Amino acid sequence: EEVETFAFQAEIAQLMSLIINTFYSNKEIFLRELISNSSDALDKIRYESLTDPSKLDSGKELHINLIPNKQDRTLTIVDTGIGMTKADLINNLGTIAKSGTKAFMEALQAGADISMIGQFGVGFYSAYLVAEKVTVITKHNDDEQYAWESSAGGSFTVRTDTGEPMGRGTKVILHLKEDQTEYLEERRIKEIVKKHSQFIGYPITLFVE
Ligand SMILES: COc1ccc(-c2c(C#N)c(N)nc3sc(C(N)=O)c(N)c23)cc1OCCCC(=O)O
After folding, report:
1. 34 CB less than 6 Å from ligand 1?
2. Rounded distance, CA 167 to CA 148, Å?
3. Longest CA span, the chain
4. Are the CB atoms for 185 and 85 separated by under 8 Å?
5. What are the residue boundaries of the structural domains of the chain, listed by start?
6. Which of 96, 100, 173, 196 is the most exposed place for a label (fewest CB within 10 A)?
């Protein structure tokens, strides 16, 4: 406390189980999905900045940072996008995930594979292909800083983040599974970004250790 615990809607909990328990070797797709979500959040603040330029008072730079940390076994994806309010964070992290899960779970029977997850607007959950726990720190102009967290298992927590303020944006912290540490390696991250994120309209900085 003051930590609020919530149950995932039944379909999202099932989707997370499917992602965690399905044998699927092409795990690298998680990075493309998170970067594309960060790209969308950055387009949103850019669209709002055209009408109201004071939306950029919380930070003018529009970028994506990829931060690996071998000591903590984390891969962090930071964007200075629109960010999420507490309600956005609680409402399936600002999506229609309940309907998207239906169409995706249906498509997986119709011949589709896990790599097509983003076409159903639930690409965020592919983080669970590599992460045993996901922490999302977010700051929206119209709200305070919040930390969302889940190790799956049907629940998630939400608390006010009293940590390092970030002005505006979202930080997706992937606490990697013990067998997924290749995603902490520079050449591996660089290869994935080059393969799946070559035409992202924002600078992508890969931090070094
Ligand atoms: C479970 O799905 C998502 C879960 C989280 C996000 C997210 C991420 C990520 N990762 C991010 N870095 N920043 C933001 S700002 C924001 C908002 N204001 O709402 C988001 N929702 C959002 C997007 C998600 O689906 C988007 C595709 C689908 C679509 O087009 O809505």
Report:
1. yes
2. 17
3. 47
4. no
5. 1-209
6. 96
CA dist 181 to 111, 132, 194, Å?
30, 12, 19
Sheet containing 204-206: order of strands: 4-7, 155-160, 145-150, 131-139, 169-176, 74-79, 64-69, 204-206
- Strand, coil or helix: what is 55? helix
Distances (CA, A) of 118 to 29, 125, 139: 10, 9, 23
Structural tokens at position 158: 């939400």
Whole-angstrom distance, CA of residue 82 vs CA of residue 38: 9
Q: How was this structure determined?
A: X-ray
Gap between the Cα atoms of 192 and 145, Å rounded: 30
Mutate to test the pocket of ligand 1, among 142, 170, 172 (most ligand atoms within 8 A of CB): 170
List residues forming the annotated binding site for ATP.
Answer: 37, 79, 98, 124
Domain 1-209 has CATH 3.40.50.970: no
Chain CA centroid to CA 128, Å: 10
For the record, the structure tokens of 59 come out as: 């930070």
Q: What is the DSSP letter of 163?
A: S
